Write a protein that binds this ligand. Structure first.
Ligand code: B12
Ligand code: B12
Ligand SMILES: CCC[C@H]1O[C@@H](n2cnc3c(N)ncnc32)[C@H](O)[C@@H]1O
Ligand SMILES: CCC[C@H]1O[C@@H](n2cnc3c(N)ncnc32)[C@H](O)[C@@H]1O
Lengths: 483, 137, 483, 137
């Protein structure tokens, strides 16, 4: 297939489906006619798109954990605990990393070893191996909407299975589920394969079945400047809407400066709506998800609560529709159900302690918002230029030329030239610009802000500051100060 | 420190890369020649690199938890490739979940790993251990 | 002695000291000449007043816990743990309640019972029974400044012992350590005995020994409107300055709405400085302390962390010089050293995650600040008028006539007519005004804000909402919504 | 007719008052005549109120933790004052610190308290126990 930002025809989409469903024997359990009927029978309280609408209307932030284990019954018991004891508003199913690399043979071995060991040797739920039948058992055992959360360059079959399995949201995108999650996958291929995932949701919407799609804002979770992260999210939203997706949650990973994070989430939401309307997508329901600190966590569990709950306070004051819950086991390993529930309870407590409260507008916030919108528009303008008006082609050439560049991304198709670092108040700025197409005025503001940190710390801004910032939160503070 | 060559990678289907970058930075600064095969590396990539570069040690990083699977059998393959006695280190977040550390260390040592590192191990600990083990303190 | 807001003469004060020092045999260990030399040998790192100055200078918020047990060595080990493992910036010593009621006989029995049981049967440290000798042993065993934290209407002897013991801050005030802490003590008598505690600090300052004084802002910890709380703190600050106090930390208890709380702390600091300078006290160094939620806590420890850390975020963004640490045992009992260190670590993590960040000015914040200052000035204006220019007499008469009125105060000299309740955003407002001398405009703003809650909840504003608000946080949310 | 009278206070050198006000409210709303002696109340104040009002029960609240000292001997003094068999309730935060609750409950029952309540007990629990114990359910 050639890559073009255009809705696949029904015929072209059907041809792809028939190939994709053959990639594992559980694909034979996907019956689009039957799945539509099953999806339409799901109560609204368990439909992710409809509950997001509810959250927007009521102006509340919903808490969603991450969670997944190899075996079906243990996974169900896990999700039931996070629902019942944790108080989750949405439920995940986090997919294991073998599935994300399409290694269902290794999934199966991991399943058997997990059975033998009495504990999960997989780092998530192998949804392709458990098939439509298993994913439905998960949905039928819980009372909350379910969303696949993962990190999969080629998610086509996983998407067929989890949607037919009644999970009414799929997370990911052709950029955000490639560059942080792969090394050898071309941007062109991941975009094409994520066109399939968006097109499947488009098909379902055309039958009246509402399914949420959530681009993965945080990317590498390591000092991603808001404007580069927002440019990715806006791009993936536009690419999804073209394939017929109607319900989109754009996401952002916390950087830690409250004003910057609130500016970012508002710019993300405002410019996502603006760009969707500019390009003729007039019936897309946009929500936001704020991810609690996605960098290295401190190992001390009390300090972990300090990160979890400050992060939640930022999410609540930003007016995030959703917040993703970190746990006090973040530094160590996949959380126990008790550690996860602990994080959920602390998060929802914080949310209820902040009911209805929003950061009011200020000069400082409006200034940071204009910075981010200007920086994001530089990147997106150049992408449309490079693609000669086609955003999907422009994304490929943007990565080829370093116009879009994700810090620390393992993908060999990521230039790895742009370098981020915090300023003196902890705002993530651009240290090295690479080929990121900023005006001199925008570059000067980044340098001005960084120079204040050089003055305060008595040292030149440098990659050592970047390393310090990478370790700072794990060592107990936001900013990587000397010593 | 006298120069020695190590192979460094992230094993299996694991895509975490920031630690790989720091470890390469740190072990390079300490005077090592780091042959960095990067993320998503099967066992064969470590061994092929160790052979081509005549490495003194293989540092297997494993963050995503499934290293307990991926790491089994590396020593045997190193023996069969003629790398008998090569140093094998494994660190990161190498099992799924918080576990009792003495049990984890024995599990990976029994797989044939010379040193086994807990979550949050500073690279300086690995560098000091490697200098000791290569007797170049 | 008659009550006047006039600095005691050296002769008057000395006459009182010789009476006070006879109230327990440990008064014989107090040698003012010797104590001055001892205080002057404490390094600056261990002087509370001087460390507050450094905190203000560096723009940082310092975390201070509460802590106290019957026995000396156990208390020392406790404080060392909070210092070393907790990372405290300041150390308390919380006095037991028998001391606060001057029942040193019962202190002595509790010491003996605590020795027999191997655990503290006292809820704090009996500083008077342990004497200067004991209090100096605490100071010599720690590396941080020491403050007595208590709740004592007649603190004269305690103050003598703990200051001569090297503790360079004393918390309290003639109002804030009477009405929430006493039943039968007249306002005139507690004001007079606190004039003593203030005058002792004034003597020490005249010798060049710097000692901090901290009025107890939160009062009853139970929905205290910011303007009533601030009027108390400004009053106690002015009454202390008149006796020669030079270093004062005015305090405020979190109400839970971030904008209201930040408005409250800034109004408190601004009007304290304004009033001090208006009344000719031109060399007083003012700092602030923000108390994390002083109402009922949730029993669940993760939820408790949610309160602890949201509260810390408010304190940091407010620019508080100091924040007092709650622990996850708040709902249950006096925390273990581990639960206290847990609270300190979560708090300090939050502070370090917010380094240098402050709430920027907003129209919303500007409005709430104007409301609070106007409300506070009505109360203080009426007090001065009632006292014919004398604030101490004005305070006695304000309590006699309900001009100053502290929600749920046990003091029979507290009118108990003013009734507080939260508005639809969680801001504490006046539900019933009693005799609080507000203008009709001020009253009408309070009613308008409360009507939004009636409209939103579908029920009339009422004392039932007050009950609901009293229980809400323990039940997992700020606002006592129905059902 | 017979409307039941209780004595309600906070024992010892304890000044906590909000719970006392809530308990007064709720037990009044439940139909009890509440003789509220308030905070900072020595044992004798409970006994004197109980005699003057012919109270059917004394509800001792102790929040500040030193109730394990202050509560000892109430039952005996109630016997010696002629109030044999009166209901003695104690609730709040009655020992210093988080403790194993069954141990605490037995300790206060061993002092002669009929019912002992853990932190955070709703008034409605005490109201229901008191109606049952007084056979007015
Ligand atoms: C940022 C992050 C992400 C980013 C990574 C971006 C990228 N490509 O690099 C994103 C969000 C994409 C990501 C994805 C996922 N992640 Co992640 N990630 C992290 C996080 C938050 C920090 C890692 C980091 O960069 N640290 C900073 C660097 C400098 O430190 P480091 O990586 O830990 O490595 C240092 C030390 O460990 C040590 N070290 C490491 N290896 C070795 C080896 C030797 C020999 C020695 C001596 C020392 C040593 O030195 C290194 C340098 O300082 C951690 C949790 C945490 N630590 O708080 C989770 C974590 C590693 N992730 C985890 C998981 C499970 C996932 C996924 C695998 C999810 C899944 N179920 O598939 C996916 C990846 C998909 C895949 N194919 O593998 C888990 C692992 C669980 C377990 N082991 O039980 C963790 C621990 C989180 C958790 N508690 O659940 N993640
Ligand atoms: C607000 C508060 C304060 C205010 C009180 C204002 C006032 N005068 O009322 C202030 C700040 C002044 C205060 C002071 C102190 N406090 Co205080 N306070 C609290 C707090 C935060 C909430 C209490 C409250 O009002 N709750 C709401 C009301 C409605 O409920 P309640 O009082 O808990 O009681 C309910 C239930 O227990 C039950 N109940 C209570 N008694 C009874 C009896 C019966 C028979 C029944 C059936 C039910 C029942 O029904 C009540 C109503 O619903 C608690 C901790 C918490 N709960 O989160 C600490 C707490 C009670 N305080 C405590 C302490 C130690 C102190 C001091 C004694 C400090 C000291 N070392 O001297 C001082 C008081 C000095 C003195 N002389 O006693 C400790 C007790 C420690 C322990 N027992 O191990 C607590 C538990 C905090 C802690 N975890 O350390 N406090
Ligand atoms: C670093 C990856 C981002 C986040 O992804 C969470 N995550 C991944 N896999 C699982 C799982 N199987 N169960 C519970 N949480 C999981 C980690 O905790 C981390 O916060
Ligand atoms: C309710 C009193 C306010 C705060 O005062 C703390 N407090 C009182 N006494 C001690 C003590 N002896 N040790 C540790 N904290 C103490 C309580 O926990 C509460 O948060």
């Amino acid at each position: 297939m050639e890559l073009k930002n255009k809705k696949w025809t029904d015929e072209e989409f059907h041809k792809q489906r028939e190939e994709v469903l053959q990639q594992w024997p559980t694909g034979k359990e996907v019956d689009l006619q039957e799945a539509v009927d099953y999806l339409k029978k799901i109560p609204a309280e368990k439909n992710f798109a409809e509950k997001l609408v509810l959250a927007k209307k009521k102006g509340i932030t919903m808490a969603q954990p991450r969670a997944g284990v190899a075996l079906l019954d243990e996974h169900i018991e896990l999700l039931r605990y996070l629902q019942d004891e944790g108080g989750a508003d949405f439920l995940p199913s986090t997919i294991d990393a073998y599935t994300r690399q399409n290694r269902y043979d290794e999934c199966e071995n991991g399943i058997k070893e997990s059975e033998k060991a009495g504990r999960s040797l997989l780092n998530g739920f192998p949804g392709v191996n458990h098939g439509v039948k298993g994913c439905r058992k998960v949905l039928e055992a819980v009372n909350l909407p379910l969303q696949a959360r993962h990190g999969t360059p080629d998610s086509r079959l996983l998407a067929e299975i989890i949607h037919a399995g009644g999970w009414t949201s799929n997370e990911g995108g052709g950029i955000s589920y490639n560059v942080p999650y792969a090394k050898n996958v071309t941007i062109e291929k991941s975009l094409l394969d994520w066109q399939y995932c968006d097109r499947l949701v488009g098909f379902y919407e055309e039958q009246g079945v509402h399914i949420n799609r959530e681009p993965f804002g945080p990317l590498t979770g390591t000092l991603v400047p808001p404007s580069m992260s927002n440019a990715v999210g806006i791009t993936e939203a536009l690419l999804a809407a073209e394939q017929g997706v109607k319900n989109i949650t754009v996401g952002y990973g916390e950087c830690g400066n409250m004003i910057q994070d609130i500016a970012a989430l508002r710019c993300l939401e405002e410019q996502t709506n603006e760009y969707l309307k500019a390009y003729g997508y007039n019936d897309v329901f946009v929500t936001t998800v704020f991810h609690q600190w996605m960098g290295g966590f401190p190992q001390d569990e009390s300090k972990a609560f300090g990160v979890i709950v400050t992060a939640t306070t930022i999410a609540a004051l930003a007016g995030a529709t959703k917040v993703i819950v970190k746990t006090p086991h973040e530094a160590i390993g996949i959380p126990t159900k008790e550690a996860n529930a602990a994080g959920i309870k602390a998060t929802k407590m914080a949310l209820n302690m902040l009911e209805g409260q929003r950061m009011p507008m200020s000069k400082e916030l409006e200034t940071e918002m204009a910075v981010i919108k200007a920086e994001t528009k530089c990147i997106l303008d150049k992408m449309f230029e490079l693609g000669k008006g086609d955003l999907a082609i422009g994304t490929v050439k943007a990565f080829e030329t370093g116009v879009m560049d994700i810090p620390f991304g393992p993908s060999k198709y990521n230039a790895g030239k742009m370098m981020p670092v915090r300023d003196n108040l902890g705002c993530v700025r651009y240290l090295e610009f690479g080929n990121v197409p900023f005006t001199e005025e925008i570059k000067n503001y980044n340098r001005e802000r960084l120079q204040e940190r050089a003055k305060f710390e008595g040292r030149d801004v440098s990659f050592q500051m970047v390393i310090d910032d990478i370790f700072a939160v794990g060592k107990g503070r936001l900013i990587g100060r000397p010593e | 420190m006298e120069k020695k060559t190590i192979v460094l990678g992230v094993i299996g289907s694991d895509c975490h890369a920031v630690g790989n970058k720091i470890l390469d930075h740190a072990f390079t600064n300490a005077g090592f020649n780091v042959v960095n095969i990067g993320v998503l590396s099967p066992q064969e990539n470590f061994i092929k690199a160790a052979i081509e570069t005549k490495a003194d040690a293989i540092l297997v990083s494993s963050l995503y938890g499934q290293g307990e699977i991926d790491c089994k059998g590396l020593r045997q393959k190193c023996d069969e490739a003629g790398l008998e006695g090569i140093l094998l280190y494994v660190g990161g977040n190498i099992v799924v979940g918080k576990q009792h550390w003495p049990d984890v260390e024995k599990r990976f040592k029994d797989m044939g790993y010379d040193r086994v590192y807990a979550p949050g191990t500073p690279p300086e600990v690995g560098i000091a251990d490697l200098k000791k083990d290569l007797n170049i303190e």
